[PDB]
Swiss-Prot record, chains A, B:
Co-factor binding details: Binds 1 zinc ion per subunit.
Gene encoding the protein: mpaA
The species this protein was found in: Vibrio campbellii (strain ATCC BAA-1116)
Enzyme Commission code: 3.4.17.-
Protein name listed in UniProt: Murein peptide amidase A
Pfam families xrefs: AstE_AspA_cat (PF24827)
Annotated Peptidase M14 domain residues: 9-240
Length: 241, 241
């Protein structure tokens, strides 16, 4: 290697409480909060979508993505960013939205059904047994409906979605983007996990041929996320795949 | 000791995604989300107020308090509960609200001023230097205004407020409640920290003679919070001080 590639130049730390990009609303939550995204600032053929907050209690990734976004000069942002697609679940401290619907079981995939499912209470609980709803067959959850119209409208080339706490990069298709992510975040890659489950966002994306990678952080606090992984998020925000 | 006091009886784990208490709104956030509290269910002379989410990125305590609340039989709840008093900052992944105001520097205390202050970027950053607003002298932030009317209306006997990541129980007055909290959460007690700062909730409470204890968790994930401290939150929700 001939020289270390340059350090990213960043908004000064002292200025980082501000958002220099005014977000645009793409909808309204069940409780009536606005759903927000920060539009990409660079024109390019590989503009995609970086997303967090599918599950309202997986917040280390929301904090890391928000800190990264506010650390990046505004004109460097290559992708649309949604800090949280489920704002009600964030203020309720729940995995599910305000109707007790797991939004990752609520996309209208071909195999979607109305029967509920169960999620795991905490990472060391031996079984998944917390009952959770998967949606109404007549009407999408508004956070789902809204994310779907946004993707229709903006056409990202890919989505990277952040979760916790499974500690892996979930790759739908042996792809370089997933390898690059595993190296950035120092996490192992697994191949094709939950891309067939009724209503998962990965299932939904595969049906549309949309590359969708999920990065599952380990169970780490927001503070450790900022201190260990800030650069990995910032890199991602500027990354060409 | 003659026998171990009885285990708390809890809603079955399988049923815990539901809230059995319908919350009441006490206001609206800057972005227009509802501000919610769950009313105490037991009549008593010592009803108080348990609160989290002053800072939008301190979410381990929101998750723990929300999981505790949904674990407790509804009729056992002795205190009002606010899972998050700053829902916009939760969906934005920021410490400050949507106007970049630190809500713990925004209460109308006697010594409140309009000058901004600075908070610490992460727990191992050597100085506080992230600039942050403290409010408008003509008008309260709506999350502050709303919490203040709620306290006026309900008259709690005490407030316990959850923060992260300082790892201590901040006691304004050498009190038993703070000792009981330090023992429950296994955290050291410190005495009179930040109860004089302009606009802090502790300063504001002291001026009204309202006992206000702050529990600062260490920097821990939500998952570890649920697994190590769930019982400590559940106990608190039923505790007579
Ligand atoms: Zn998740
Ligand atoms: Zn705090």
């Amino acid at each position: 290697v001939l020289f270390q590639g340059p350090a990213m130049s960043l908004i000064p730390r002292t200025e980082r409480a501000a958002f220099l990009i005014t977000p645009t609303s793409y909808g309204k939550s069940v409780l009536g909060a606005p759903l927000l995204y920060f539009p990409a600032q660079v024109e390019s053929n590989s503009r995609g979508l970086i997303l967090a907050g599918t599950h309202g209690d997986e917040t280390a990734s929301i904090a890391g993505l928000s800190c990264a976004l506010r650390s990046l000069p505004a004109e460097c942002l290559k992708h649309d960013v949604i800090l949280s697609m489920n704002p009600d679940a964030n203020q309720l401290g729940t995995r599910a939205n305000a109707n007790q619907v797991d939004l990752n079981r609520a996309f209208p995939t071909q195999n979607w059904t109305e029967h509920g499912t169960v999620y795991r209470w905490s990472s060391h609980t031996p079984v998944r047994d917390v009952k959770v709803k998967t949606g109404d067959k007549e009407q999408l959850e508004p956070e789902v409906d809204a994310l779907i119209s946004l993707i229709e409208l903006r056409r990202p080339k890919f989505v990277v979605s952040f979760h916790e706490p499974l500690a892996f990069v979930d790759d739908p298709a042996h792809s370089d983007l997933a390898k690059w992510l595993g190296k950035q975040f120092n996490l192992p890659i697994v191949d094709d996990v939950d891309y067939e489950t009724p209503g998962s966002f990965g299932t939904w994306c595969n049906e549309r041929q949309l590359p969708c990678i999920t990065v599952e952080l380990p169970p780490i606090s927001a503070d450790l996320t900022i201190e260990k992984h800030l650069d990995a998020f910032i890199a991602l925000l500027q990354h060409d795949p």
